[PDB]
Paper text:
Deeply buried in the core, Trp95 is essential for folding stability, whereas Trp60, which is solvent-exposed, plays a crucial role in promoting the binding of β2-microglobulin to the heavy chain of the class I major histocompatibility complex (MHCI). To understand the possible positive effects of the replacement of Leu95 with Trp we investigated the structural impact of this mutation on human β2-m.
The Trp95Leu mutant was crystallised according to the protocol used for the Trp60Val β2-m mutant, yielding crystals belonging to the same space group and with the same crystal packing observed for the β2-m DE loop mutants, as recently reported. In accordance with the single residue mutation, the Trp95Leu mutant crystal structure is very similar to that of wild-type β2-m (R.S.M.D. 0.55 Å, calculated over 97 Cα pairs), and the mutated Leu95 side chain matches the location of the Trp95 indole ring in the wild-type protein. On the other hand, the cavity created by residues Ser11, Asn21, Leu23, Phe70, Pro72 and Tyr78, which perfectly fits the bulky side chain of Trp95 in wild-type β2-m, is only half filled by Leu95. Given the hydrophobicity of the cavity, however, no water molecules appear to fill the gaps, leaving the cavity partially empty. Such a condition is unfavourable for protein stability and, together with the loss of an H bond, certainly contributes to the lower stability observed for the Trp95Leu mutant. Consequently, the presence of the mutated Leu95 residue is reflected by increased flexibility of the downstream residues. The whole 96-99 segment displays poor electron density, and could only be modelled with 0.5 occupancy. In the Trp95Leu isoform the electron density for the DE loop is of poor quality; such a loop was modelled in two alternative conformations, with residual electron density suggesting an even higher number of conformations. The presence of Leu at site 95 induces a destabilization of 1.0 kcal/mol, with a Cm shift from 1.9 to 1.65 M GdnHCl.
Residue numbers in the entry: 0 to 99
Amino acid sequence: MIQRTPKIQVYSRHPAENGKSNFLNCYVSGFHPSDIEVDLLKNGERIEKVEHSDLSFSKDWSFYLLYYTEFTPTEKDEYACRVNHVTLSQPKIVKLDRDM
């Protein structure tokens, strides 16, 4: 058996074909087992509508999840990604930093 803590990256992107739109992304990588809980947060509250959740695995059965959705950030709102996994004794919250 192997267990591996996910790496978590939180960032924003504009799709080049629709540049006025903006996406909040949580990329959760390299984890095992695949059991996992992932949410995007706006001002500490779970975002219920997350339109994309893309899961894959590599050759060594490491899992990769891109969890992302359209958002409209203001400078007062705080966004983050919250992950729980067996390797994490408490939920891990990673903020979207200003500029990312």
